[PDB]
Design an enzyme around this catalytic site. Structure first.
Site, PDB file in Angstrom:
ATOM      1  N   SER A  61       0.813  -1.245   0.000  1.00  0.00           N
ATOM      2  CA  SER A  61       0.000   0.000   0.000  1.00  0.00           C
ATOM      3  C   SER A  61       0.839   1.286   0.000  1.00  0.00           C
ATOM      4  O   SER A  61       0.311   2.377  -0.207  1.00  0.00           O
ATOM      5  CB  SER A  61      -0.919   0.042   1.184  1.00  0.00           C
ATOM      6  OG  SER A  61      -2.060  -0.786   0.961  1.00  0.00           O
ATOM      7  N   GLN A 117     -11.168  -4.643  -0.496  1.00  0.00           N
ATOM      8  CA  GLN A 117     -10.570  -5.282  -1.656  1.00  0.00           C
ATOM      9  C   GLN A 117     -11.555  -5.354  -2.783  1.00  0.00           C
ATOM     10  O   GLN A 117     -12.768  -5.482  -2.549  1.00  0.00           O
ATOM     11  CB  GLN A 117     -10.188  -6.721  -1.338  1.00  0.00           C
ATOM     12  CG  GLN A 117      -9.303  -6.901  -0.131  1.00  0.00           C
ATOM     13  CD  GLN A 117      -7.878  -6.404  -0.386  1.00  0.00           C
ATOM     14  OE1 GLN A 117      -7.553  -5.929  -1.480  1.00  0.00           O
ATOM     15  NE2 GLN A 117      -7.025  -6.504   0.632  1.00  0.00           N
TER      16      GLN A 117
HETATM   17  O1  LIG Z   1      -0.926  -2.711   2.328  1.00  0.00           O
HETATM   18  C1  LIG Z   1      -1.539  -2.709   3.442  1.00  0.00           C
HETATM   19  O2  LIG Z   1      -1.099  -2.293   4.493  1.00  0.00           O
HETATM   20  C2  LIG Z   1      -3.054  -3.061   3.445  1.00  0.00           C
HETATM   21  S1  LIG Z   1      -3.865  -2.561   4.866  1.00  0.00           S
HETATM   22  C3  LIG Z   1      -5.354  -3.212   4.331  1.00  0.00           C
HETATM   23  C4  LIG Z   1      -5.212  -3.786   3.104  1.00  0.00           C
HETATM   24  C5  LIG Z   1      -3.868  -3.725   2.546  1.00  0.00           C
HETATM   25  S2  LIG Z   1      -3.425  -4.376   1.130  1.00  0.00           S
HETATM   26  O3  LIG Z   1      -4.439  -5.254   0.694  1.00  0.00           O
HETATM   27  O4  LIG Z   1      -2.911  -3.427   0.231  1.00  0.00           O
HETATM   28  N1  LIG Z   1      -2.147  -5.462   1.411  1.00  0.00           N
HETATM   29  C6  LIG Z   1      -2.376  -6.572   2.325  1.00  0.00           C
HETATM   30  C7  LIG Z   1      -1.630  -7.901   2.208  1.00  0.00           C
HETATM   31  C8  LIG Z   1      -1.342  -6.983   3.370  1.00  0.00           C
HETATM   32  O1  LIG Z   2      -1.165 -11.285  -2.972  1.00  0.00           O
HETATM   33  C1  LIG Z   2      -0.860 -10.463  -2.040  1.00  0.00           C
HETATM   34  O2  LIG Z   2       0.131 -10.462  -1.304  1.00  0.00           O
HETATM   35  C2  LIG Z   2      -1.926  -9.345  -1.865  1.00  0.00           C
HETATM   36  S1  LIG Z   2      -1.347  -7.771  -1.623  1.00  0.00           S
HETATM   37  C3  LIG Z   2      -2.925  -7.130  -1.523  1.00  0.00           C
HETATM   38  C4  LIG Z   2      -3.857  -8.104  -1.673  1.00  0.00           C
HETATM   39  C5  LIG Z   2      -3.307  -9.422  -1.874  1.00  0.00           C
HETATM   40  S2  LIG Z   2      -4.133 -10.818  -2.098  1.00  0.00           S
HETATM   41  O3  LIG Z   2      -4.273 -11.153  -3.466  1.00  0.00           O
HETATM   42  O4  LIG Z   2      -3.693 -11.821  -1.184  1.00  0.00           O
HETATM   43  N1  LIG Z   2      -5.727 -10.586  -1.573  1.00  0.00           N
HETATM   44  C6  LIG Z   2      -6.125 -10.810  -0.204  1.00  0.00           C
HETATM   45  C7  LIG Z   2      -5.553  -9.932   0.909  1.00  0.00           C
HETATM   46  C8  LIG Z   2      -7.022  -9.839   0.550  1.00  0.00           C
END
Ligand SMILES: O=C(O)c1sccc1S(=O)(=O)NC1CC1
Ligand SMILES: O=C(O)c1sccc1S(=O)(=O)NC1CC1
Ligand SMILES: O=C(O)c1sccc1S(=O)(=O)NC1CC1
Ligand SMILES: O=C(O)c1sccc1S(=O)(=O)NC1CC1
Ligand SMILES: O=C(O)c1sccc1S(=O)(=O)NC1CC1
Length: 358
Positions: A61, A117
């Site tokens: 993020s 998401q």
């Molecule tokens: O990036 C973050 O902090 C956050 S905080 C809430 C969602 C996300 S994310 O979906 O983009 N990445 C997830 C796997 C940790």
């Molecule tokens: O692939 C990753 O690391 C990430 S990074 C952000 C979302 C995802 S995901 O595809 O797992 N989706 C799940 C967190 C809701």
């Protein structure tokens, strides 16, 4: 390096790495505008590859800061306005609940409850359209903040539509290239594979999976050197030669909404400096950071405030990253790790370091 920086960084990060069982980490401190770099551990445990200043990490993020600045650049180019209705850029979005939802609301998570998401079931353009058409808001636009990839991700996609460029082309040519971020990528090219760290989740090596609006919301990979340069560019935008990008940086740090002590920018979040460390540390916990919070509109937005703690946390399944800076003090930090470890630990370490150097 200056011994004070050496000492504060090592004495903070060594215990953090031990306590959190982080396999590899890179840190940059920007002090009076100059970067100092530190690395520990392994980019690839199995292959015994160390973290170096050239190692790529998934920003997760933290990518939203690039999206926000790219969007700001498009405003400065006159291609979009944050006051534009979302439907101006997506005419197929005819559902009535979209009346009144603007690009500002998408960029700042205030559209009225777009979800964290995009559903994994969304695997096509027609799927994405159905998803947004069918989404029902919980709240009127501009009344509550709910952190959401589906919100800022759509903002990024729509912000580049007038340019005609793909999101990735726009980011490369309008943000990465002018800032000489030559090892920052939305898609890691084969040439850089040897430098791309594995992420580790429960000890298993993992990389981020493809998903809808991934590039826009969580898809950037970068090195500690490029991230230091990103911090320098955001600390001091007037030094940037490209006028629209300078302006885009300024717009991304403007204050659009307030909840508690926090102000929402485009991607970036800001607090007044000096900050209560408890506010940023506890506030970074996902139990707070991801909650539905009523917001106060800042009407009109306050231009970027120098005396701010400006920051963003970010993660993927296998990575955990944090960036913070204080324009007033010419001071900043980037912490990139290949394990997703708790946000408050990142912010506590970052504050201990910047507080000692301020
Ligand atoms: O990036 C973050 O902090 C956050 S905080 C809430 C969602 C996300 S994310 O979906 O983009 N990445 C997830 C796997 C940790
Ligand atoms: O692939 C990753 O690391 C990430 S990074 C952000 C979302 C995802 S995901 O595809 O797992 N989706 C799940 C967190 C809701
Ligand atoms: O982090 C963990 O849970 C675990 S558990 C087994 C390996 C790992 S790891 O390699 O990713 N951690 C680093 C310190 C060795
Ligand atoms: O100030 C307001 O009107 C409002 S209205 C909604 C949030 C806020 S706030 O968070 O900035 N102030 C809260 C702490 C007391
Ligand atoms: O910064 C803002 O929010 C806004 S919004 C309108 C102008 C400004 S600014 O001139 O102070 N600085 C940057 C946009 C050019």
């Amino acid at each position: 390096a200056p011994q004070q920086i050496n000492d504060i960084v090592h004495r903070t990060i060594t215990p953090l790495i031990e306590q959190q069982k982080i396999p590899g980490m890179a840190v940059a401190v920007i002090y009076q505008g100059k970067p100092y770099y530190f690395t520990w551990g392994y980019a690839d445990i199995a292959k015994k590859q160390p973290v170096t200043q050239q190692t790529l990490f998934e920003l997760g993020s933290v990518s939203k800061t690039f999206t926000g600045v790219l969007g700001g650049d498009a405003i400065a180019r006159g291609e979009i306005k944050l006051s534009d209705p979302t439907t101006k850029y997506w005419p197929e979005l005819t559902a009535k609940q979209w009346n009144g939802i603007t690009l500002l609301h998408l960029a700042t998570y205030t559209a009225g409850g777009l979800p964290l998401q995009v559903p994994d079931e969304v695997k096509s353009s027609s799927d994405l359209l159905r998803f947004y058409q069918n989404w029902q808001p919980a709240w009127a636009p501009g009344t509550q903040r709910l952190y959401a990839n589906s919100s800022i991700g759509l903002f990024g996609a729509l912000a580049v539509k007038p340019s005609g460029l793909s999101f990735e082309q726009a980011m490369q040519t309008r943000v990465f290239q002018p800032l000489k971020l030559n090892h920052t990528w939305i898609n890691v090219p084969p040439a850089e594979e040897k430098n791309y760290a594995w992420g580790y989740r429960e000890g298993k090596a993992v990389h981020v999976s493809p998903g809808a609006l991934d590039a826009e919301a969580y898809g950037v990979k970068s090195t500690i050197e490029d991230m230091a340069r990103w911090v320098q560019s955001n600390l001091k935008p007037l030094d940037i030669n490209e006028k629209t990008l300078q302006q885009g940086i300024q717009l991304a740090q403007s204050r659009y909404w307030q909840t508690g002590d926090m102000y929402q920018g485009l991607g970036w979040e800001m607090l007044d400096w000096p900050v209560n460390p408890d506010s940023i540390i506890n506030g970074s916990d996902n139990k707070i950071a991801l909650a539905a919070r009523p917001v106060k509109a800042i009407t009109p937005p306050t231009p970027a405030v120098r005396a701010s703690w400006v920051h963003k946390t970010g993660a993927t399944g296998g990575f955990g990253s944090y960036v913070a800076f204080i324009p007033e003090k010419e001071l900043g930090i980037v912490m990139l790790a290949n394990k997703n470890y708790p946000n408050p630990a990142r912010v506590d370490a970052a504050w201990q370091i910047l507080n000692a150097l301020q």
